Amino acid sequence: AAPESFDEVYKGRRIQGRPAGGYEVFVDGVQLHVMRNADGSWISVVSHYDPVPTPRAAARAAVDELQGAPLLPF
Amino acid sequence: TVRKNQATLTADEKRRFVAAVLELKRSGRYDEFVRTHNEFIMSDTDSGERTGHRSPSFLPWHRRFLLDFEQALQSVDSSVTLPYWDWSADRTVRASLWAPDFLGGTGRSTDGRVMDGPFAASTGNWPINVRVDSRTYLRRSLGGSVAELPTRAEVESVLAISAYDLPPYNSASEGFRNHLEGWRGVNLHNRVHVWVGGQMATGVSPNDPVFWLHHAYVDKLWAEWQRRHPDSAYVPTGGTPDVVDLNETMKPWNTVRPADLLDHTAYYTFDAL
Numbered sequence A: 001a002a003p004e005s006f007d008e009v010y011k012g013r014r015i016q017g018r019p020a021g022g023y024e025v026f027v028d029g030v031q032l033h034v035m036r037n038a039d040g041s042w043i044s045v046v047s048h049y050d051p052v053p054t055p056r057a058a059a060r061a062a063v064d065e066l067q068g069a070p071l072l073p074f
Numbered sequence B: 001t002v003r004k005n006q007a008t009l010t011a012d013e014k015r016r017f018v019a020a021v022l023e024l025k026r027s028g029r030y031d032e033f034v035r036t037h038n039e040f041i042m043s044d045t046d047s048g049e050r051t052g053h054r055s056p057s058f059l060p061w062h063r064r065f066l067l068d069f070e071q072a073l074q075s076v077d078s079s080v081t082l083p084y085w086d087w088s089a090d091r092t093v094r095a096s097l098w099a100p101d102f103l104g105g106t107g108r109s110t111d112g113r114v115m116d117g118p119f120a121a122s123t124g125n126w127p128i129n130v131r132v133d134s135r136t137y138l139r140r141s142l143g144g145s146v147a148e149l150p151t152r153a154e155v156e157s158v159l160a161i162s163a164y165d166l167p168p169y170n171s172a173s174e175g176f177r178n179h180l181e182g183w184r185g186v187n188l189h190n191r192v193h194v195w196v197g198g199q200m201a202t203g204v205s206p207n208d209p210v211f212w213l214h215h216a217y218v219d220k221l222w223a224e225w226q227r228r229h230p231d232s233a234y235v236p237t238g239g240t241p242d243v244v245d246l247n248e249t250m251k252p253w254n255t256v257r258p259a260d261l262l263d264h265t266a267y268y269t270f271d272a273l
């Protein structure tokens, strides 16, 4: 069962997640590759060695990583 | 071909390695290694096809990737080989690894930009082209997102694990491969990527030349594991969906199998094993 959707402004940026593989995340409207691990944790392409518990946590980690920079689509 | 501990390189060998890396960048070849790696990072998944990561083939895949990259270096300067970074030993930002004559240091705190060494954006010689974060300069934050590199005692506990890998052959597995990769346990290889930060923490991690030195030491640890467990070998050994079995070929090359990569000595030796 996929996680719930989310939508918030985090550090001045809009982060959105929704079930869709399986789940999509956007940062200011640009899609961010995210992936779920077998134990239920998540990563994103800009934190791909660093599991966090939820897709929102991965989106927030991406905003932290980007330090205000636009994301490029994958 | 001898792969040496980075700490032991002469000034001449550091100069030649750097120059060879910068020429692969200039000619356009370097960035395609970054692209290949990211394509596999993004496609290797725990419940479907998985080849370069989170699977038994993590180790032979990166061994063959590093050989491709070493051969490209040697096509520029035949004397160059890939050095390795023993992060259990050279574990601070003061390691000669991070000196301006080798890889340069950590990034400045505002934007993570590396400001010295041959790969600093200001040199004009290291554009970050293959990227997700839209910034085009090499970034690092050594020790920023995780406080410590693995220790020798931690490495030794992983080395002591006798099974190469175990079902379900993914990031949930017990066994040596997944403990070395780091998704379970005290965490060796993934934590080093997180510790360097910047591009090394992302799917385009070969953007940082330390990527190669990190994976050359991971590769050395597989060789040491084999010496510790000569009765253990690569698994699985046939008929496993979505996973590369011992005698199956691996993408993207398609012409090589884990079986062809188990013995590193067919391609290189280490300064000491």
Ligand SMILES: [O-][O-]
Pocket: B053, B205
């Ligand atoms: O694994 O990079």
Ligand SMILES: [Cu+2]
Pocket: B037, B052, B053, B062
């Ligand atoms: Cu990799």
Ligand SMILES: [Cu+2]
Pocket: A033, A034, A035, A044, A045, A048, B041, B042, B043
């Ligand atoms: Cu992914």
Ligand SMILES: [Cu+2]
Pocket: B189, B193, B215
């Ligand atoms: Cu790696």
Ligand SMILES: [Cu+2]
Pocket: none
């Ligand atoms: Cu014995």
